[PDB]
């Protein structure tokens, strides 16, 4: 097995939520989990994070969880459960913030966090051959194409571009901070 607790609970949580959305409908689940979309929702703290848990298409959940399982799982095994927790909380909160800024609160997906993990695993392999956390050359290629497809909207349901940029930024910023060690 190569799923730590944290890699695993996140996969589970995303699956459960995705089931909820097929059963109750997307809007119904958004209503409960979306970034605050009204002044009356601002103290509902779970919302600054739980938008990460919602997926809108089968290809969305599947690609997000494939990358999570892999990079997230690499990060947990080599660097520990708490590092992945903090990349995750920070990426989710910060991507959510920039996404709603540009485009308002109706958005969801783990891909702000996947982008943080991509940028993080890459830049920390490059400035620290010693976690050994690294992003394998073939996988930098598959990651770049992924990045590109979002930016130029190559998927055919439209994309949380704020959340993507913010996500990657946070992952770079943290790899930077982390590698600047010994």
């Amino acid at each position: 097995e190569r799923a730590g607790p944290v890699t695993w609970v996140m996969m589970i949580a995303c699956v459960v939520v995705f089931i909820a959305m097929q059963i109750l409908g997307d809007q119904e689940v958004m209503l409960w989990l979306a970034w605050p979309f009204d002044p009356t929702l601002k103290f509902e703290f779970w919302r600054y994070f739980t938008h990460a848990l919602m997926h809108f298409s089968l290809m969305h959940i599947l690609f997000n969880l494939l990358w999570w399982w892999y990079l997230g799982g690499a990060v947990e095994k080599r660097l520990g459960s708490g590092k992945l927790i903090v990349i995750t909380l920070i990426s989710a909160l910060l991507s959510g913030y920039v996404q709603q800024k540009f485009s308002g609160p109706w958005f969801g997906g783990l891909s702000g966090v996947v982008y943080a993990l991509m940028g993080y695993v890459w830049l920390r392999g490059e400035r620290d051959p010693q976690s050994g956390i690294y992003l394998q050359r073939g996988l930098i290629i598959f990651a770049l194409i992924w990045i590109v497809a979002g930016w130029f909207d190559l998927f055919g349901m439209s994309m949380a571009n704020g959340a993507h940029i913010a996500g990657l930024a946070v992952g770079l910023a943290m790899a930077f901070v982390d590698s600047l060690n010994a």
Binding site: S57, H60, Q99, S103, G108, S111, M157, M159, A160, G167
Partner: peptide
Amino acid sequence: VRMA
């Protein structure tokens, strides 16, 4: 909606 927008997908992240």
